[PDB]
Amino acid sequence: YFQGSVFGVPLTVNVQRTGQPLPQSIQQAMRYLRNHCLDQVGLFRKSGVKSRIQALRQMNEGAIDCVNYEGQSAYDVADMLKQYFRDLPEPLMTNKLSETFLQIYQYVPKDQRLQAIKAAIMLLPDENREVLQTLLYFLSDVTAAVKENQMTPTNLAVCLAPSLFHLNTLKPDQKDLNENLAATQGLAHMIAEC
Amino acid sequence: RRVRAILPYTKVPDTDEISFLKGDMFIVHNELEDGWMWVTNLRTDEQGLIVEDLVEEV
């Protein structure tokens, strides 16, 4: 793993190199979105621009100084976050957690689904749990402005679950499609109640 | 429960949505929060997510 690299670097390497699982570039991106972008209609849905997103990645990778995001399109930054969580070596929510969500929504009754989800999250590594707590707080703050951005928790889940779970998409078996639906449902449930 | 699309829509890339044309009928498999529905498009035989705002019950 190269020195000062953000994308494609697992959270454990980030912890061993800096002491925190999320890089400061990604945290500053989240702060920029929280401070100057929460009212943008269709955030995380309206696509950015490939050139601007690639310039943002250029900024992140190799920069020893602090990465400034002022004067950047909100959708470019949102798509950059989606690409960072997509470009992780393993998904933030481990490959087993999508199957666990499927098992929860299939065999666990509705009144105990939240407890099973919390237990499943507690079965994750410490770094993944910290990053997930930070990201869930951020997405709750985002969806709190639903009167301005029209981003409901389920809408945010639809936009972000493929990046967080590393799901498949068709143009895949039935079990995998059920896993996709259950992962989206679980992400929406976690975002709605945070 | 079946629905019919009243407007064309293109999938957001790298998501579980499905594109459809005006008139496409879907069979609703699951109903989610905020008007989202997991459905199978009868034209393309693909399963995915659609929003209630673009469909009408039949």
From TrEMBL, chain B:
Domain SH3: 1-58
Subcellular compartments: Cytoplasm
Lineage top rank: taxon: Eukaryota
Binding partners and assembly: Interacts with SQSTM1. Interacts with SPSB1; the interaction does not promote degradation. Interacts with CAV2 (tyrosine phosphorylated form). Directly interacts with NCK1. Interacts with PDGFRB (tyrosine phosphorylated). Interacts (via SH2 domain) with the 'Tyr-9' phosphorylated form of PDPK1. Interacts with tyrosine-phosphorylated EPHB4.
Protein name: Ras GTPase-activating protein 1
